[PDB]
C-alpha cells in the first residue's frame, strides 16, 4: 500500500473525488433548509 499511496494520492487530486461527495450529502441527508 506504500508504492500504491503514489498513484491513490494523485488520483483524487484529479478533481473526480470532489465530486464524488456532493453526492454522499444528499444520498445521506436531504436538502432540507435551502434560502
Request: with cysteine; glycine share 14%.
Amino acid at each position: 500500500a506504500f508504492r500504491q499511496a503514489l498513484q491513490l494520492a494523485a488520483c483524487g487530486l484529479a478533481g473526480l473525488s470532489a465530486a464524488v461527495l456532493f453526492s454522499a450529502v444528499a444520498v445521506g441527508k436531504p436538502r432540507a433548509g435551502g434560502d
